[PDB]
Amino acid sequence: GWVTIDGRRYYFEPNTAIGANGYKIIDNKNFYFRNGLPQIGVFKGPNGFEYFAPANTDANNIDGQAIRYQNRFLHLLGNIYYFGNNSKAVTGWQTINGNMYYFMPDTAMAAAGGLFEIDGVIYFFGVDGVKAPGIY
């Protein structure tokens, strides 16, 4: 369960003595742990990528708790994400507000800042992740 060491909260499994790791459901809340410490970021759960957010981002969530986050972009540590109606980060080719993006399969982060090979073809992405016109 939850213990406080120095000042931060850690979670341990009832079968171990070292902190939990990976995606976990705890009393209707979602977390992604690293050596017991909830991680902030966009990580893969059982139904896609969730936003495990800084505390008090939505509905008084705690640090690392997954949140509702609908129909909007997120900038996180310089990486660009887009979240759909179901609060999951989109992947692959997407058209958003008339612009095309490609969200990478391993991370859900937008391809950005030049040429990428995707599906065997070379494409160009602006610094903002927007696919540029024409053939590359």
Epitope: G113, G114, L115, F116, E117, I118, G120, V121, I122, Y136
Partner: nanobody
């Protein structure tokens, strides 16, 4: 993933030269491969890149129409065919593999490099 370059030397302006970049392993064929060129004391500037599939290419505006990048799956080799060569093309040429398929114009994104070979165009 070891890369061996060949084909370097000297040509007159307007002439042609073909460079080869041969890999030691079949995994090479799964990744995009680029050529960069470098003048003495200068930085490695982008020339051309080819997709893993061999059918998608991008050229520096400077060389579009004159240079062709291609690959031979059976030989695990990428080529740079240089036509209508100009003195401006004189440089050391490198081939390189970008296994992450990310930001293909940027040499810092490339994780394996050939040894580099001198091309000289005399006018």
């Amino acid at each position: 993933v070891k890369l061996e370059e060949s084909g370097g030397g000297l040509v007159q302006a307007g002439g042609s030269l073909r460079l080869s970049c041969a890999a030691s392993e079949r995994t090479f064929s799964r990744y995009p491969v680029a050529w960069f060129r470098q003048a003495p004391g200068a930085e490695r500037e982008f020339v051309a890149v080819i997709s893993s599939t061999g059918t998608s290419t991008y050229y520096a505006d400077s060389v579009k129409g004159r240079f062709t990048i291609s690959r031979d799956n059976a030989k695990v080799t990428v080529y740079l065919q240089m036509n209508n060569l100009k003195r401006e093309d004189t440089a050391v040429y490198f081939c390189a593999v970008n296994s992450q398929r990310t930001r293909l114009q940027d040499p810092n994104e490339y994780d394996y490099w050939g040894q580099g070979t001198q091309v000289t165009v005399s006018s």
